[PDB]
Write a protein that binds this ligand. Structure first.
Ligand SMILES: CC(=O)N[C@@H]1[C@@H](O)[C@H](O)[C@@H](CO)O[C@@H]1O
Ligand SMILES: CC(=O)N[C@@H]1[C@@H](O)[C@H](O)[C@@H](CO)O[C@@H]1O
Ligand SMILES: CC(=O)N[C@@H]1[C@@H](O)[C@H](O)[C@@H](CO)O[C@@H]1O
Ligand SMILES: CC(=O)N[C@@H]1[C@@H](O)[C@H](O)[C@@H](CO)O[C@@H]1O
Ligand SMILES: [Ca+2]
Ligand SMILES: [Ca+2]
Ligand SMILES: [Ca+2]
Ligand SMILES: [Ca+2]
Lengths: 385, 385, 385, 385
């Protein structure tokens, strides 16, 4: 029975820890995959962790990592939430150096992109069998979310980008049914830059908060209905959500240029004019993480917000983060449960090792209260190398 | 279908070996988690061993163990009984440094407590999805059972402690349905001290024999009805159950102070006025283990009992032990099966190693006869380190 | 639906290979249990390999093997047929240094013996839960089949021995239903010696070919109805089946004392007056294996037989062997499939290693034809040690 | 419900990546089987990777490989597609040094050949239980496909060969149901040579594109109906598909002798008079791979074709490749999905190592457009040895 996306986000006060895989600590001896972007996505029965791997295990020579980010060995795989990804427990999803995934209430939809930079192809799979294809339309590194896609009333949506990771690029939203694209639309976003979008359904519509790797310190967003009729803009809060970024000053609803000329995948949940912002604690490195609730901060510009909940000390490494959802058909709740995951990146380029891999941690909405704390990776580098 | 807890503990005469994981022996080479408090809990279909892990494998540097007991890397996980807990056969349960779990006949309820000592929070998960949250009400290490919680007529119950592990602390019994706290009561237990309670259902009510880490060599207990109406006391048997403890002399129904100023998690099963006491054979170390049947020693003070069933020789290490239940809905029986598990702790602080982990063995009630013997851990220390 | 054992053994011409786990070759690097007696047993849906482990992995110091055969670390476990027994793939079954197991059509019945030699206790489990217990009645190493038990019309049977492995011992046949002994009978077998019995159903009755470790080179047997009414004797074929044994001269239906005062677990399939004798190729060592069809040789004394099919070359090591069956309820056949497994023992006492473990291979009945050959263990010794 | 193979091959324009196991790369540290011929086969619910192993793991001395190709340790096993084959995730299928498998909609049929060269026997298993047997009829290495068999209307078909690998051999087509050979036919193919066939169903009939190891650079084919009434020939295209082979010159519908005196397992898909030829890129080595679409080329002789899609660069090792099928019962399509898998061989005889093993990559039909690229094995040799 297809997943209805007609309810709204559950109201929340804080975030309770949901999972921690300690994959890097475990990989020190155990056969664990060296991964990146471990995004979580759920069905009507379970939540799994998808990730991308170079096809190498920690503490092995094949984790050398000097390899191009987009190699032909990069594959999309998944394993149950909270477990360390290893060949002994991970399911194979797709060959990909960029992907996204989601369940529509019936079967899983996975999107893996592979191929050369000048003509990559997104392979759509529905319940493990290829159902469609999408070719780069700008021949300049087709890429997608690196996090969960959003499904509503039996249709799922994703956002792909094609073009330079600097200046203007091309951006399209896709709507698929049973893994088949039934409609796509190019965004008319001059001066915007979308990458690695974290999307989620809310009252039958989708909202995506993404990464402006071109010239913005704030995060850009797109929200659209089931017919790809959309709207775009930026989070106006002076509580800049990208990394790097400048100290929290006055923002704008259009790309803040001051230091936002690069970035990190991230997310944000919208509630009225308010926004739950997930971000690193450092303005220069992917270190630490914290959840900030800036009411009237999605449409306004301030430096003021009401709540700050710590997740990773500034003293420890963090990395990509993304939103994932829990539907009422899984929860029994009468609303959509917002949750998020954080990638704790270890190794290069910040540490003196020959590899790069990340652990994951995740938290969910919740009405009751929580506590801020630090749940870092905890691995002692360097490894036996 | 919900687990009815209306029947009574089956009448027994001894304890038969149920399981032995040989985790440490296996971990010398295998990818086994370094664990603590491996408690067992069953559903209406299977039994699992839950445990807490620092997220490190045996024989790996990350097992350094100098780390604080309550680290953000501690996670609650579970695997099938008798199996060595590895990242390849364990399911992720919750992030926690203290926890409990039980099945109501429908889904698993897990309780993982994590966060800072002055504001730790217990996350409750029904079927893997956060269903409620509990905050430290004393801001001094909210902690729980470290063993199975007890369910009855669709409601599960647990005991939590907050406050000093020395003098008076606070104790609350919680009643939850579908992982949600519907009622809670704070025990008016002046001069009592409760920790790591081992609870079990019996004729529609719950009984917990716990650990008095403040000032008792004997074990305190609490039994309550489904409405949290309770009674409290101490096992009065001169066969003292805690460790450390004095030589078996004359007991009492209120904290025996001679030597009882510390402790170890344990259990005891009440039968009329008698008691089946599980305990270490040594009075100073967590070494050895034996079952003692003191008929009518739950209310009377003696040193005499009638049956002693050896489990682990004084020459071998033991540790935490807890009780776990088999419901008629799993057994087909017309009574509830009292069973117990013993943690065989190896390493620090008693052994010259850099780590500390434990193996498990479990036994079950039974009418037919048994035999005493010694089922120690069996690992040759130290390891490759 | 209970397994009906009313059909007879399927007629056969030879034996086709069914499986080979290569556990020892794989154990060189993999995490394989060091094991003994990997007997096979099937349900109405699958076949599993059961085995006993000291709880150590190959190539690990804990596989030291100088330990007493019956240690408190020996555990009964199973994994799918053909797979290497590892803690990552094996299911825990019971704590035991001696055991048997069989499925009745509904659930598995496992029997594990543990405890001291002067009072070992067999714990019977049905679907993982203890359903009965049997104590030693001679207080001298209670032991059982070390292979599959036989179930018929919803009742399972097994044979246990208690007493010396030299002279006269005591033997009993047990009948259980849902893991509970409903009837037992002590065999009045003066001058007989039964050990490690290989039993199987045939037309509603059980026939067991065992090991006479006291004073017989030929194998003794017992057959009984569902009410434990029995018959006993020895295979009279001059083609002696035990090991050690003398060269095939003239047998008798009463213990051949020439060279058979020790032994090895083996099996045999009776067809009318004929016999399919499985046995080692050497008369002094557990080396090589072969299947021999001596028609009119279960009741007669000769040296002549009509067929010899090679399984393991005299040049390679063999060991325990046992029968297992495949019921029509699993097969679709209108008869019971006779099959057998062979333990390929490597290490001590015949090799200069510090351990002892075995691989397994199995074969099944079959109308079509087969071929003789050699399916040896294949591991290179010694190991890294 | 039995797989109906009455529909035809789906029309296609290119091939989309389906999987990549990275087994060898992962095998540097992880416990991965050293394998060969990892052919893929699907049921009505999942797709699996079958493969032959010497019962050894990468980077372990037992991978020494100087062992005969046909050893008694070789076993046919299978794990899920895209997963590295390890003893922790692979299912045992059969003892075999030559094999094939396919699902008929109800259960899996596996065929594993074992035994000596002068009398090998093929064991057929339907749902894991032996259902038939086939003896060598020429006593000269009875061998089979090493890829998926084809099922249609409840009957599966395979092609086996017995006799020399040089001159004339004997070729037989077997029709089996529920794993029992209901009919067979020896091909009357003078001057033909069939080995390692890649068969597939289409409109109720089977077509196989095999390997001529005797005297052909082009591939021989056989197509038959469900009554084993067949036709034979060679692909006439001057785009020679075998390896070794000559530069694409002029083909013939009869063995192209020149340079065609050896070979490699391969496949091809026929569409009218056209062919989708998969082949290595090199003409002397098993390196590189590409898919070529030569319309009107199955019946014609040319050097011209319209499409070439790279899969593996000439600078990277390839190996065996074969075809596997999707059926409309697993896909929901109204046609049969043609797919293929390529074996990436690393080690001997081309590389300075002691072992030989292969990784796998797979692609499927697809109407949408794809991209040619290079998805090589990616391991860094030599290994720790
Ligand atoms: C520890 C290790 O293997 N590091 C090597 C490094 O020495 C070498 O310079 C580099 C270039 O290929 O590859 C890896 O980084
Ligand atoms: C063998 C080993 O790795 N032990 C180290 C030890 O040398 C060091 O003093 C301690 C302090 O962090 O950490 C670990 O215990
Ligand atoms: C390689 C190894 O550790 N072998 C030891 C051996 O040296 C020692 O004499 C014996 C005593 O228990 O134990 C093991 O056999
Ligand atoms: C690295 C290694 O151990 N290789 C050995 C090689 O030295 C030996 O000559 C050969 C003969 O069996 O076996 C293995 O290939
Ligand atoms: Ca930016
Ligand atoms: Ca105490
Ligand atoms: Ca004997
Ligand atoms: Ca050729």
């Amino acid at each position: 029975v297809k997943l209805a996306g007609n309810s709204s986000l559950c109201p929340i006060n804080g975030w309770a820890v949901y999972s921690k895989d300690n994959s890097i600590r475990i990989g020190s001896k155990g056969d664990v995959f060296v991964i990146r972007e471990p995004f979580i996505s759920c069905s009507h029965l379970e939540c799994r962790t998808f990730f991308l791997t170079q096809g190498a295990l920690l503490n092995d020579k094949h984790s050398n990592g000097t390899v191009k980010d987009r190699s032909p060995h990069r594959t999309l795989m998944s394993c149950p939430v909270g477990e360390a990804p290893s060949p002994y427990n991970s399911r194979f999803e797709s060959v990909a150096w960029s992907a996204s995934a989601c369940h529509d209430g019936t079967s899983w939809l996975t999107i893996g992109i592979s191929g050369p930079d000048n003509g990559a192809v997104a392979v759509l799979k529905y319940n493990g069998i290829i159902t469609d294809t999408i070719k780069s339309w700008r021949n300049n590194i087709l890429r997608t979310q690196e996090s969960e896609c959003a499904c509503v009333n039996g249709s799922c949506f994703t956002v792909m980008t094609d073009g330079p990771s600097n200046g203007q690029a091309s951006y399209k939203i896709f709507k698929m049914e049973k893994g088949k694209v039934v409609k796509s639309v190019e965004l008319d976003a001059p001066n915007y830059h979308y990458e690695e979008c974290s999307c989620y359904p809310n009252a039958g519509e989708i909202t995506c908060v993404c990464r402006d790797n071109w010239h913005g310190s704030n995060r850009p967003w797109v929200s659209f209905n089931q017919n790809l009729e959309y709207q775009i803009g930026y989070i106006c809060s002076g509580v800049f959500g990208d990394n790097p970024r400048p100290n929290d000053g006055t923002g704008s609803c259009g790309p803040v240029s001051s230091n936002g000329a690069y970035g990190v995948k991230g997310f944000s949940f919208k509630y009225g004019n308010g926004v739950w912002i997930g971000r690193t604690k450092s303005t220069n490195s992917r270190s630490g993480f914290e959840m900030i609730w800036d009411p009237n901060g999605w449409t306004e510009t301030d430096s003021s917000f009401s709540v700050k909940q710590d997740i990773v000390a500034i003293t420890d490494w963090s990395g990509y983060s993304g939103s994932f959802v829990q539907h009422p058909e899984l929860t029994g709740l009468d609303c959509i449960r917002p949750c998020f995951w954080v990638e704790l990146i270890r190794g290069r380029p910040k540490e003196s090792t020959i590899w790069t891999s990340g652990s994951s941690i995740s938290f969910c909405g919740v009405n009751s209260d929580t506590v801020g704390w630090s749940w870092p990776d905890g691995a002692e580098l360097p490894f036996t190398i």
